[PDB]
Amino acid sequence: EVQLQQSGAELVRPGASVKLSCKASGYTFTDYEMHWVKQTPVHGLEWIGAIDPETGGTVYNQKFKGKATLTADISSTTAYMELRSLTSEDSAVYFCISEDIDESKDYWGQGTTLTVSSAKTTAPSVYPLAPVCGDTSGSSVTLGCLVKGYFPEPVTLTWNSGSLSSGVHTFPAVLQSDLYTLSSSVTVTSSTWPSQSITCNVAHPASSTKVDKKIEPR
């Protein structure tokens, strides 16, 4: 099995540099090329460059020439990309792609989220959303979780540690005053809540935060 593990999310100050990684496993590291793709909502998928791990020769796009620097290590089978002179335009989702010799096959990583801003990290404020005590008479019930005032993206939210997935809607966070606001809703049968406990689990890696908030009646 071929698997690529990239680095975690980055919050880099504007003007500084960063170096992302891409750990390749499951094939001969020197046989397959290593490419890098930058994904932005405005420009879409942009091809940064590529590198041959056996010879070390690289090739860049004319736009990302000088901005990015692709390297590779064979003893650790890991590729790297150094981004210098970072600005807000560099905040994006970066992928590494190992291109198999068979042109039908290629392998993508999970992606690295690069956020570049002078705003410092902010842990989220998790607020439980419970029904009004008069709307528990329908065929089902719905609870909520408000992840307000955090920075930067992302946060990973779950319900009952992921054991409650279907009937769950987590919404894209909206940025206001340099603070993200997010929310989630979970629908279960009328017999489930509140006899069985329901908790939303919010994780913010940039601040090393994990708050678990129970949903209890009013």
Added chain:
Amino acid sequence: DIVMTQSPSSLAVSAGEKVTLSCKSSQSLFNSRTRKNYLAWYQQKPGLSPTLLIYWASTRKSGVPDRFTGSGSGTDFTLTITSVQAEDLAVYYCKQSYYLRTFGGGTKLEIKRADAAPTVSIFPPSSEQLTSGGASVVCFLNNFYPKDINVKWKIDGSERQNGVLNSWTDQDSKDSTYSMSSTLTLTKDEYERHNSYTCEATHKTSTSPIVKSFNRNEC
């Protein structure tokens, strides 16, 4: 540098219906030496990485269902889905490999389903948020179709539009519906000075709007 441009940008279709996507390149992608048009089609589902479907612009990768069929030559290519299924909800890109590399703008595929009335729920501010000094009434609108919907807030009957944060979602893979979050954020005092709060939803599945209200002096 080779530039790629796809068409259309957005496309809706029913289940089982045919779909034709187009990918135009600013330069020919035919290598006369290898006699292959280096043009690939990728399917990126939301939250996932792009996966390869068609390489050499006409050859289907092993494992891809035979309904995906790419064709074209030179500067004009197409990806044809003969029987679109709900699992095909994704954005389809096209990557050229004649020169270094270049992706297209992408094509978002949306499937059509039966009209569904939104399930509306309203939630008063929690206690700890009022302890911090703020207030947020959270109104969820779940599992409706189509995407067109409007939301109005009514405090004591008076409409409220400033101080509202909305968040739409993409189409679900399970039932092909949509969802929307609408949070009205007020101060603690202004929250504790009015009485009734109303989340009103206007959707084409019902002539009368679907309302959900609550009072502070109850429960």
Added chain:
Amino acid sequence: DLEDNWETLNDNLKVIEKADNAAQVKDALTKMRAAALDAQKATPPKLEDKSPDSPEMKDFRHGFDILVGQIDDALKLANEGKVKEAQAAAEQLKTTRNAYIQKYLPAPLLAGVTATCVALFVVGIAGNLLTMLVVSRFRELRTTTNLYLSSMAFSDLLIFLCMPLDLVRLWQYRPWNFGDLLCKLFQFVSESCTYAKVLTITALSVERYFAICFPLRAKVVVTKGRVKLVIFVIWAVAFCSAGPIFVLVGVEHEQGTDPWDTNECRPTEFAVRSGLLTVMVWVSSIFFFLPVFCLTVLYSLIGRKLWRRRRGDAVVGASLRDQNHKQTVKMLAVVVFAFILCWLPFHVGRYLFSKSFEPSQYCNLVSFVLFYLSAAINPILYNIMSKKYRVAVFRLLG
């Protein structure tokens, strides 16, 4: 003297055949009688060891009795005046004479193999000398590989210098009157140059493998100096491992036979009762087959790294090192293949000779030819493969 009397007889019979007057036939017949009896008194070289009363001598003299009798009859017929009859008696005289002349006094394949070995001798000497001189008088060709190939060129040179005695022994195998020291010497030198060739090819291939796979070679493969040390040690091991030849081969003859007729240059009896023959055959057998394995694996790895499969969509270049490495590795690959292919029947035949020494033609001949065909073919392959070599040769000559 027998030769003088015989030339006298042929001369006077020549006169009789071209004599018109009967007097000329009379004189020539008289002198033929005199030289015939004088020749009969003389002892032939083939019957000097036998006693005078031996039967062979009595036959040799009996033929002379018949001869002089015919001379008497012809002399009578000439005294009569019948020239034709005396000339006919001289004709039958010539018949009996010729009969007792011839009585008491592989080849095309040999010409072919010998001529071919001469061709490979000329093209070999000239080719390898041109190789060493090309490496000598040009800066851009004094690389390490060219040094190893120059030592190999000298090894081919010395092998061809050992060819003559090997060919003389190839056809003239019944007598070996050249001596014992030569019989040991030329085979010792030939075997030594064999070992130097194989060890030099192997060392060269090892250096290419380390040079391509381990670019830390800059420290390891230092300069020409390392190559000169490896050449020195290679030739020393070649001379020491081929030393026992001086005990292995020798000149021997049967018991009770004339040594000048039964001397041969072959493994000695002591070299057989003690397995020095089989030991040496296994020594050179390792010296060839083991480096054949090493060359196969090493060039397999070099070809695996240089000629690696690449996705057609590859965007990065070729590094400009694998191009030159592909050139010299192509050349060296063809050279090694020709080496193994040429010297394989040689070692096979030597193995069969060793195994047969404890209880065909074109096989031994084709091994004899191929053995030198390698030494001659290496410079030709240099001329075909390497463009720099061709340019250097044409720059030296024209």
